Amino acid sequence: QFLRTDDEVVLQCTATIHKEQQKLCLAAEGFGNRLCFLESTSNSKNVPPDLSICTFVLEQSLSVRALQEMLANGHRTLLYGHAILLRHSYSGMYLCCLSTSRKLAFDVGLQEDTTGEACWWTIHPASKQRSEGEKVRVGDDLILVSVSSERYLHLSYLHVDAAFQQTLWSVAPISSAQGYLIGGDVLRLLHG
């Protein structure tokens, strides 16, 4: 029902190149490829898509004044208008707004150090129907704005780069027990 701290989610656009409903999702490789790329997931039965390197976990949610209190130097629910940490669930690196380009749009990629203004991303409702301070349910359509550059997390044409222009971002969660099977797991196969 709700998106709470430390709930593993994805990030997922829809892009149309001559009526494509190609629901490409935000992937990040890590490990020698710092930049982010797109993992197209609308051929989800034609291609059983690589979903290991696409999941992100909300490490910590804070309002903007709380982020300034942190820059003066636990499952809470998050609200619209808050600046969140997006860890990459696999590589452990935090998603940040890099200072590199490949016009005026910075590249979107991973990093290690949680400090600074680059790791954090402010959320915005993409609606007049939904507004500031109220909760973010499962399946909403939101906007991620960087804190450092104050650029939107823009979908170029198919790069992903932090630019001045909006793009919707849908959030469908992945997970939220001990000794029990959970999808996406990696296991060995004992016989007897």
């Binding site: 300034q68 820059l71 005026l104 910075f106 203004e117 450092s148 550059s149 104050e150």
Partner: peptide, 30 residues
Amino acid sequence: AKGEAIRIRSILRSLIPLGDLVGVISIAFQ
């Protein structure tokens, strides 16, 4: 380190990216 002043100044860096010197020098003869 004011925070907001630094950020804004970086946004002012990010556009007109210091290749402005051609538009400086090419005036000084004409």
